Amino acid sequence: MKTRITELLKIDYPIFQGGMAWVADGDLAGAVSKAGGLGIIGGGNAPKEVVKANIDKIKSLTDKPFGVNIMLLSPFVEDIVDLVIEEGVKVVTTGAGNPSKYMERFHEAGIIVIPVVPSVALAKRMEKIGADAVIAEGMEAGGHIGKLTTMTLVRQVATAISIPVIAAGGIADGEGAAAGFMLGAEAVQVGTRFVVAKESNAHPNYKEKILKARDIDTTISAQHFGHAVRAIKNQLTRDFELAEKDAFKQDLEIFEQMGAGALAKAVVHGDVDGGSVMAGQIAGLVSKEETAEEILKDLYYGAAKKIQEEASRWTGV
Amino acid sequence: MKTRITELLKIDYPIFQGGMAWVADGDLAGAVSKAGGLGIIGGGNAPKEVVKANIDKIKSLTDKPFGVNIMLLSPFVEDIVDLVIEEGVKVVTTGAGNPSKYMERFHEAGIIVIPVVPSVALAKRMEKIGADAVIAEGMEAGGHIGKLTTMTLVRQVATAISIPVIAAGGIADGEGAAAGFMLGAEAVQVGTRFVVAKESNAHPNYKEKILKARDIDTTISAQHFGHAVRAIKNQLTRDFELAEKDAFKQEDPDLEIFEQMGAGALAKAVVHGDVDGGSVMAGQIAGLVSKEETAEEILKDLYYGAAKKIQEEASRWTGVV
Numbered sequence: 001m002k003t004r005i006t007e008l009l010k011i012d013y014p015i016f017q018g019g020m021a022w023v024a025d026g027d028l029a030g031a032v033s034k035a036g037g038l039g040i041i042g043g044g045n046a047p048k049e050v051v052k053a054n055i056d057k058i059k060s061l062t063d064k065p066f067g068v069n070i071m072l073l074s075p076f077v078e079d080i081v082d083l084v085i086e087e088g089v090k091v092v093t094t095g096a097g098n099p100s101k102y103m104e105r106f107h108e109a110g111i112i113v114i115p116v117v118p119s120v121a122l123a124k125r126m127e128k129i130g131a132d133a134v135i136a137e138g139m140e141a142g143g144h145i146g147k148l149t150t151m152t153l154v155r156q157v158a159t160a161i162s163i164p165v166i167a168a169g170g171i172a173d174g175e176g177a178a179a180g181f182m183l184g185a186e187a188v189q190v191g192t193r194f195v196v197a198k199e200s201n202a203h204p205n206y207k208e209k210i211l212k213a214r215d216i217d218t219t220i221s222a223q224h225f226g227h228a229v230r231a232i233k234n235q236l237t238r239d240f241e242l243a244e245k246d247a248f249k250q251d252l253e254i255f256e257q258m259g260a261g262a263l264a265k266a267v268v269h270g271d272v273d274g275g276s277v278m279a280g281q282i283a284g285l286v287s288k289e290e291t292a293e294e295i296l297k298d299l300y301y302g303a304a305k306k307i308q309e310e311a312s313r314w315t316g317v
Numbered sequence: 318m319k320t321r322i323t324e325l326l327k328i329d330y331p332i333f334q335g336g337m338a339w340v341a342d343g344d345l346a347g348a349v350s351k352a353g354g355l356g357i358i359g360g361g362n363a364p365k366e367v368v369k370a371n372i373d374k375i376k377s378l379t380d381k382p383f384g385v386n387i388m389l390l391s392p393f394v395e396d397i398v399d400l401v402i403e404e405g406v407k408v409v410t411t412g413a414g415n416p417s418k419y420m421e422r423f424h425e426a427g428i429i430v431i432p433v434v435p436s437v438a439l440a441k442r443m444e445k446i447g448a449d450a451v452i453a454e455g456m457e458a459g460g461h462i463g464k465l466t467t468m469t470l471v472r473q474v475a476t477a478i479s480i481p482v483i484a485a486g487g488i489a490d491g492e493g494a495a496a497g498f499m500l501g502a503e504a505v506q507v508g509t510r511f512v513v514a515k516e517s518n519a520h521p522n523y524k525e526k527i528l529k530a531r532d533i534d535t536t537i538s539a540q541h542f543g544h545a546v547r548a549i550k551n552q553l554t555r556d557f558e559l560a561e562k563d564a565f566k567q568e569d570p571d572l573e574i575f576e577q578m579g580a581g582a583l584a585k586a587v588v589h590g591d592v593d594g595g596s597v598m599a600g601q602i603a604g605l606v607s608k609e610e611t612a613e614e615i616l617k618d619l620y621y622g623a624a625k626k627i628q629e630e631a632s633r634w635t636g637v638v
């Protein structure tokens with residue numbers, strides 16, 4: 001099997017392990033890339049020397065292609081742009097910001113550029129400015145979310161643009177992967193499930209929170225401030241929502257002191273009470289710690305089996 | 318081809334036209350059932366005589382199975398429950414409320430019961446009290462919504478229960494329908510796209526709102542009150558939002574403003590085409606809906622479009638083991 005994504009990126013599986021701040025370090029990304037998917041380092045708000053450490057690590061683990069996810073509103077964005085070009089990174093994905101500032105520079109260096117998009121208008125603009133592909137990420141995803149769901153966003157984006165679309169948000173098995181393809185995506189991006197990979201350095205407490213999570217255990221915080229974040233319910237989200245209910249009755253320092261280094265606390269130190277346990281709605285389905293390779297194969301061969309089984313049921317229609 | 322749903326309901330297509338208040342009358346439901354899908358009358362908050370008129374209409378149009386969607390918190394719920402038994406309706410779907418009260422009564426009558434569920438826990442409980450199937454409706458759906466999306470809800474519900482699951486929310490072409498099947502659904506339920514059916518009596522202004530909508534043109538109203546409703550943005554949604562913000566700043570706000578804005582809002586839009594002051598309920602998939610077609614053409618696009626997509630993807634994936 002081939003897709004425009006497998007062919008453009010020269011990878012065996014049409015599966016990205018999503019760039020994730022703190023979680024997506026060299027070890028995790030390396031494991032995914034070695035296994036045949038696209039590992040992606042989460043640049044987040046890390047300065048150059050930190051991101052370089054992860055790139056050094058991945059290059060020591062595998063020679064296969066990998067991505068770096070750049071957060072464009074990072075105070076260190078200019079350094080991270082330098083770094084990926086300096087290091088010969090094959091693929092860049094970008095969060096919310098303005099990739100147009102960097103597009104020609106990336107392309108003059110030979111980098112493939114794949115912005116994350118929350119809307120049809122944004123996907124069309126990304127295509128217009130020369131993006132090689134886009135990731136359509138549903139609001140069910142972990143982390144900073146838009147408003148459209150994977151079902152409706154992926155379908156509408158795939159219809160609107162000619163460049164390949166990668167479905168992200170809510171995918172944690174072969175069935176979910178296959179659905180993504182049915183909507184018109186040519187690859188899938190998986191986040192939540194990769195956090196519990198054996199090669200993931202997410203604290204055991206963070207992984208445990210995902211493993212034990214029910215379907216209904218995520219919530220959206222900070223929606224009223226225009227910075228909606230999806231995470232597993234805990235003391236932080238409760239205290240945050242309590243303070244939001246308060247604020248809607250009327251001071252924003254209480255929120256940024258509540259949120260300051262929240263993700264790091266959880267991922268690195270396993271403070272899953274006071275930290276931010278970002279994860280998607282599909283956390284409910286994620287129930288086993290497995291190797292990155294095992295996850296990739298389950299996603300890929302699970303998709304294949306489901307598609308073949310369903311094709312059999314639908315033959316002659 | 319057949320699924321457990323086509324077998325249970327004795328219909329040709331594993332496709333429901335979802336019950337919709339005001340929009341899903343006998344004409345639309347009749348047209349869908351006649352063409353081989355499951356038409357479903359929207360009971361809404363209507364009294365017995367109004368719902369009966371719709372049942373009488375379908376029966377005059379087709380002998381084929383149809384459903385009635387019952388809103389369990391309606392002041393006339395007991396009468397609508399009477400009505401569906403009295404008229405020998407084959408299927409009942411249930412939106413709002415817990416149908417446990419009525420489950421044995423429906424089954425003694427021989428009715429197939431299919432509750433709409435927003436969670437794994439509720440799906441499992443519907444299963445154990447005897448539901449014949451469940452509809453897993455994603456938050457992208459038009460109307461009163463839960464929090465889980467179609468991608469995540471359908472998948473988790475299908476893995477959790479043995480009874481068949483129907484995917485609803487965000488489906489408006491063969492690709493969306495095929496996706497629902499991949500997630501483990503054995504039928505799909507479609508709302509938004511059936512609103513623009515030629516046989517739909519939604520006012521031309523209402524249809525035009527859906528047809529011109531973009532992907533980002535829906536919004537959720539009344540979340541601060543805990544009463545989430547998805548609709549196309551308009552003066553009503555702007556008014557409700559501004560009023561909501563203002564109310565929460567007051568010690569003792571007059572909540573009559575909200576019941577005056579919302580009362581009969583859907584009916585105003587659907588029957589009379591007040592798409593500025595009325596409620597234009599519609600799903601996020603409204604942006605994809607671009608064509609007025611017959612119920613049959615919509616059914617066939619969904620069904621044969623799904624078959625085509627599955628066959629195309631099978632050709633891409635064949636031999637992968």
Ligand SMILES: Cc1cc2nc3c(=O)[nH]c(=O)nc-3n(C[C@H](O)[C@H](O)[C@H](O)COP(=O)(O)O)c2cc1C
Pocket residue numbers: 017018019020021023042044069071094095116137140141142143144168169170171189190191192193195277278279280281282
């Ligand atoms: C812990 C965590 C951190 C994330 N951080 C980022 C990020 O820094 N940049 C970004 O573009 N996406 C971020 N995401 C989104 C993922 O890259 C991915 O698209 C998403 O997790 C897919 O949805 P899923 O979680 O349902 O699989 C993050 C997700 C998680 C779970």
Ligand SMILES: Cc1cc2nc3c(=O)[nH]c(=O)nc-3n(C[C@H](O)[C@H](O)[C@H](O)COP(=O)(O)O)c2cc1C
Pocket residue numbers: 334335336337338340359361386388411412413433454457458459460461485486487488489506507508509510512597598599600601602
């Ligand atoms: C105008 C409109 C009215 C609706 N009214 C009801 C209702 O009364 N009861 C119910 O269970 N669902 C109601 N729904 C939801 C549908 O029955 C169906 O599940 C939903 O529209 C499917 O999602 P979709 O709009 O993305 O196709 C309504 C939907 C719309 C668009």
Ligand SMILES: [Ca+2]
Pocket residue numbers: 095116137141142143144145146
């Ligand atoms: Ca995001």
Ligand SMILES: [Ca+2]
Pocket residue numbers: 157158159160161162163
């Ligand atoms: Ca396309």
Ligand SMILES: [Ca+2]
Pocket residue numbers: 027198199200201
């Ligand atoms: Ca390790």
Ligand SMILES: [Ca+2]
Pocket residue numbers: 412433454458459460461462463
């Ligand atoms: Ca509903």
Ligand SMILES: [Ca+2]
Pocket residue numbers: 474475476477478479480501
């Ligand atoms: Ca099942």
Ligand SMILES: [Ca+2]
Pocket residue numbers: 344515516517518
């Ligand atoms: Ca008519």
